[PDB]
Homo-oligomer: A and B are copies of this chain.
Amino acid sequence: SSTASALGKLQDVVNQNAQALNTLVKQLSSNFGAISSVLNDILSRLDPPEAEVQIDRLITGRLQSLQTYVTQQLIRAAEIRASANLAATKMSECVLGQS
């Protein structure tokens, strides 16, 4: 009841997930080499024959960011699953019997 910072692991897992989501959603505000960071502006400001190039740059940048996020999520999920297996083994052994 009294001591603080007694639940570091759950708090840091939640913080890591929140930070990953935050940086992923923050990555949408970059030019990636194009003339603007928002799609509607370039759609409504000029002729398609260049809008295709701008959209191509946006697409490749956003695809790279999404792939990086997915890979990080997969790694963290694997680690969490291993921890859950260890917890299940401990529950089965040290509760339903004497170790």
Give the number of copies in the complex. 9
A92 within 8 A of B: no
Contacting residues of chain A (35-70) with chain B, CB-CB under 8 angstroms: 56, 67-68
A78 within 8 A of B: yes
A4 within 8 A of B: no
A75 within 8 A of B: yes
Chain B's closest residue to A71 (CB) is: B71
A79 within 8 A of B: yes
Contact with A33, one of B56, B67, B71, B78 (Cβ below 8 angstroms): B56
Kindly list the 6 A-B residue pairs having the minimum CB-CB distance in the complex, ordered from nearest: A74-B75, A71-B71, A75-B78, A78-B79, A67-B68, A78-B78
A82 within 8 A of B: yes
**Set of chain B residues within 8 Å of A71, measured between Cβ atoms:** 71
Report the minimum CB–CB distance from A13 to chain B (whole Å). 16
